[PDB]
Amino acid sequence: LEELSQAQRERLAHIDFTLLFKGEAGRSYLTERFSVAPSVATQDFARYKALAPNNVMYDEKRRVHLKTSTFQPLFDYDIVRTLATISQGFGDGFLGKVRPPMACEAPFHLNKPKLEVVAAISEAIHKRAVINIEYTSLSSGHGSRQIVPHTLIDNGLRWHVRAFDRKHREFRDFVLTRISEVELLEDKVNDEVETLQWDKQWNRIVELELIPHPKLAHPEAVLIDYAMENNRLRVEIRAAFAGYLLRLWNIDCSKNSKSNGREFHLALKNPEALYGVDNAALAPGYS
Amino acid sequence: EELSQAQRERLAHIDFTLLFKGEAGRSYLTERFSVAPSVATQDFARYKALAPNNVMYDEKRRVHLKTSTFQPLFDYDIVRTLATISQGFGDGFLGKVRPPMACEAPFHLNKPKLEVVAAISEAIHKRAVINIEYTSLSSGHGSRQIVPHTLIDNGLRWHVRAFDRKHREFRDFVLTRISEVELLEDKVNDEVETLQWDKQWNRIVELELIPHPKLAHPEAVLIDYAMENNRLRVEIRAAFAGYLLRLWNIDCSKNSKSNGREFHLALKNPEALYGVDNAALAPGYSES
Numbered sequence: 001l002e003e004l005s006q007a008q009r010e011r012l013a014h015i016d017f018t019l020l021f022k023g024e025a026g027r028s029y030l031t032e033r034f035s036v037a038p039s040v041a042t043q044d045f046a047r048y049k050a051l052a053p054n055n056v057m058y059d060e061k062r063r064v065h066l067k068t069s070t071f072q073p074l075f076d077y078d079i080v081r082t083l084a085t086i087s088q089g090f091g092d093g094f095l096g097k098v099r100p101p102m103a104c105e106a107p108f109h110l111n112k113p114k115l116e117v118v119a120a121i122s123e124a125i126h127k128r129a130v131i132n133i134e135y136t137s138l139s140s141g142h143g144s145r146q147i148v149p150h151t152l153i154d155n156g157l158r159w160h161v162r163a164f165d166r167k168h169r170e171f172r173d174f175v176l177t178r179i180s181e182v183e184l185l186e187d188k189v190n191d192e193v194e195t196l197q198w199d200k201q202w203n204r205i206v207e208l209e210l211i212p213h214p215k216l217a218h219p220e221a222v223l224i225d226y227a228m229e230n231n232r233l234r235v236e237i238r239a240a241f242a243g244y245l246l247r248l249w250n251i252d253c254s255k256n257s258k259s260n261g262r263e264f265h266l267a268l269k270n271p272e273a274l275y276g277v278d279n280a281a282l283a284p285g286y287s
Numbered sequence: 288e289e290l291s292q293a294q295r296e297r298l299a300h301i302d303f304t305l306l307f308k309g310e311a312g313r314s315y316l317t318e319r320f321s322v323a324p325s326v327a328t329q330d331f332a333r334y335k336a337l338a339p340n341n342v343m344y345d346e347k348r349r350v351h352l353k354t355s356t357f358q359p360l361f362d363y364d365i366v367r368t369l370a371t372i373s374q375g376f377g378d379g380f381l382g383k384v385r386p387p388m389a390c391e392a393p394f395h396l397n398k399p400k401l402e403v404v405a406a407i408s409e410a411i412h413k414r415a416v417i418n419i420e421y422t423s424l425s426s427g428h429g430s431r432q433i434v435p436h437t438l439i440d441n442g443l444r445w446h447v448r449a450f451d452r453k454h455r456e457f458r459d460f461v462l463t464r465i466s467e468v469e470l471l472e473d474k475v476n477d478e479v480e481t482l483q484w485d486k487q488w489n490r491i492v493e494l495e496l497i498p499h500p501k502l503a504h505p506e507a508v509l510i511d512y513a514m515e516n517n518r519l520r521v522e523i524r525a526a527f528a529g530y531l532l533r534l535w536n537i538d539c540s541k542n543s544k545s546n547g548r549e550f551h552l553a554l555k556n557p558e559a560l561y562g563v564d565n566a567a568l569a570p571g572y573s574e575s
């Protein structure tokens with residue numbers, strides 16, 4: 001299996017995937033996905049049958065290979081990336097719009113940042129550069145400022161950049177869809193103030209204990225849902241994320257689990273862990 | 288367009304690297320594509336020919352540089368591209384991948400089991416009935432037959448939209464609470480159990496989102512959500528409305544007067560939620 005070309009492993013994995021997620025796989029799946037010759041696809045299936053003979057049985061009528069009752073995946077899957085592929089499409093995205101390969105929807109996306117804005121911030125992070133941006137903030141409206149970006153973030157809802165803000169001299173999030181212009185500058189980065197190692201809220205990890213909400217009649221449903229152990233799920237997140245994510249995850253973070261207005265499945269067992277976390281007040285019910 | 292698919296892919300990876308880093312060298316192509324070192328030069332030459340005003344080789348740095356006049360050679364799927372830079376380069380079928388840059392996506396908790404998602408996807412593809420074990424919030428553990436038709440990545444969990452034969456209704460099942468899946472040979476009643484009869488699924492609700500009225504700077508929300516005429520029109524399946532309005536933190540109360548949650552957006556027309564099952568999950572929504 002490891003003697004093969006990268007291209008050959010990718011096409012084998014696509015056979016594995018198609019058998020696992022559809023009932024079946026034929027030469028047309030490989031020629032559509034990879035634009036290989038039909039004769040190449042035939043060799044692919046032969047390599048697959050040789051590597052996993054008990055995974056596939058051939059159907060002579062329709063000329064498709066069928067998933068058996070004893071199927072075991074030939075490869076390990078990145079589950080996050082695999083779920084992105086079935087809900088988005090098969091490429092890396094660089095060759096135009098793609099579409100999901102199955103009846104799968106992901107309706108939670110609203111608008112995305114502009115390609116050029118994300119690319120420019122990404123470039124500045126890679127080059128360790130200062131950038132001038134225009135930014136329209138909720139707190140003060142439109143303006144300009146210099147920032148020293150260090151990380152791009154897909155948070156639940158929007159994209160933001162974690163950066164040192166030279167306007168107010170603090171590390172801060174900037175929502176990418178509110179960045180209007182990006183200009184790479186030659187100004188020097190102060191590696192004693194402005195770089196990632198000084199970002200305390202970024203570098204502080206908070207250890208959260210999530211438990212089934214006490215009001216639930218069937219907490220065992222939540223134990224299975226979140227793959228909990230010892231009645232809890234331990235999650236470690238950067239303090240700079242805690243507010244965003246606790247609200248996004250709809251976690252009851254009130255002391256007694258009685259401040260609600262919502263329909264919580266999870267409660268934060270140890271709200272003490274949010275002490276000193278900038279923007280913990282975004283977490284539902286946190287006081 | 289006259290090139291092989293493998294060659295167009297290598298040209299798109301050059302375009303991406305120049306766009307997202309300042310630069311691109313042969314090592315990026317051999318790492319990503321495992322082509323011979325001599326193949327990468329062929330790629331950059333092909334790229335230089337197709338877009339000469341985008342690149343500028345530096346002999347000392349041994350690297351091709353993005354010019355000030357760069358315009359991407361390809362169109363990008365923005366959702367999938369943002370996924371790739373926050374997840375990694377494969378399709379995911381060859382093992383764990385890692386982001387190609389300083390980019391984090393910290394909102395994922397656990398995912399459904401590979402075999403469970405695959406079994407449901409297979410049943411949807413074959414238009415089959417499945418027996419599942421399911422642990423519900425209302426009744427705990429049990430088993431039932433369901434007729435799945437669509438897989439959903441909602442904001443928070445994955446679910447399958449299906450006809451539930453236990454209570455004879457269309458319904459969501461969270462994939463992480465499905466423990467066993469068994470494909471059946473049982474016949475589907477295409478007059479009761481298929482997608483066309485799923486009313487909440489087929490009903491599209493037309494939401495008008497506006498900057499929240501309590502904001503001092505609504506102009507920040509206007510650029511954020513790319514609004515026009517001070518509103519964003521969003522069309523979603525009724526079966527999604529509750530989930531998504533909560534996930535998006537949209538104020539859906541009649542007279543606002545709701546800012547204990549720091550909303551950036553308000554639902555201008557909560558009348559559009561009447562008769563939507565689980566509208567109650569929408570922040571501040573009150574019908575009766």
